Amino acid sequence: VPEGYESLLERPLYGHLATVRPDGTPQVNAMWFAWDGEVLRFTHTTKRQKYRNIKANPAVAMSVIDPDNPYRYLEVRGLVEDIVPDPTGAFYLKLNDRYDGPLTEPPADKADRVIIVVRPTAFSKQ
Amino acid sequence: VAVPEGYESLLERPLYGHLATVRPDGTPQVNAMWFAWDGEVLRFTHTTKRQKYRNIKANPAVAMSVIDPDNPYRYLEVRGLVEDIVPDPTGAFYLKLNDRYDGPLTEPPADKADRVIIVVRPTAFSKQ
């Protein structure tokens, strides 16, 4: 990550995750995310189009901008490298906690929850 | 294609839109952008010299994500097609976008000779 920009990834900001649909056209959805210094993790259910997109095309990109300073932003390109079942909704609650989210209990859709793990290939800030 | 009823307000606000395009190799690109909405089409400022432009010349399909900055449960996803690309060699359109956002970019850009207006007609909206 280029120098001075990793802090974007540490903050509880909404990332805009782009995927490619089966028809070859793009889709973009605003998302919580977690960065661990190596990979990005997202909460998803197996029911939505964005999940189906990544099962067929694992290449993704995520945009984040600093809400306090429009000069600071990042596009992260990467590949989905794992999809991990989260049937207790523990990972959803971890994100909820980082974002001071409204859930007080595991999500009702927990049986269908997964963790999408994305390993970056590029970070661009300009 | 009609905006969902009461969400057009998000497109009227000076919020960033995160515009996704697809590269010729089939992988996506997404960038935070100023946009303008006139009730029918979205307009963006680009130059002819970057990858985002090359992406749209080969695949006109795009998607834009805008989120309310204070309530993240309020959002709008717009899919659409680039239907025009208009030269902006004076940077006048770029300066109108800056004005819409009350931004600091009040003088024409050094790259103005290569500036264009990208015009996108929506094909779909989602807010849930």
UniProtKB/TrEMBL annotation, chain A:
GO terms for molecular function: aflatoxin reductase (coenzyme F420) activity; coenzyme F420 binding; oxidoreductase activity, acting on the CH-CH group of donors. GO terms for biological process: aflatoxin catabolic process; coumarin catabolic process. The keyword Transferase does not apply. Transmembrane segments: none annotated. GO terms for cellular component: cytosol. Keywords: Oxidoreductase. Residues 4-123 form the Pyridoxamine 5'-phosphate oxidase N-terminal domain. It comes from the Bacteria. This is Pyridoxamine 5'-phosphate oxidase-related, FMN-binding. It comes from Mycolicibacterium smegmatis (strain ATCC 700084 / mc(2)155) (Mycobacterium smegmatis).
From TrEMBL, chain B:
InterPro entries: F420-binding_dom_put, F420H2_bilvrd_red/Heme_oxyg, Pyridox_Oxase_N, Split_barrel_FMN-bd. Keywords: Oxidoreductase. One of its GO terms (cellular component) is cytosol. SUPFAM superfamilies: FMN-binding split barrel. It comes from the Bacteria. Residues 6-125 form the Pyridoxamine 5'-phosphate oxidase N-terminal domain. One of its GO terms (molecular function) is oxidoreductase activity, acting on the CH-CH group of donors. One of its GO terms (biological process) is coumarin catabolic process. The keyword Oxidoreductase applies. PANTHER family: HEME OXYGENASE HI_0854-RELATED. NCBIfam families: Rv1155_F420 (TIGR03618). This is Pyridoxamine 5'-phosphate oxidase-related, FMN-binding.
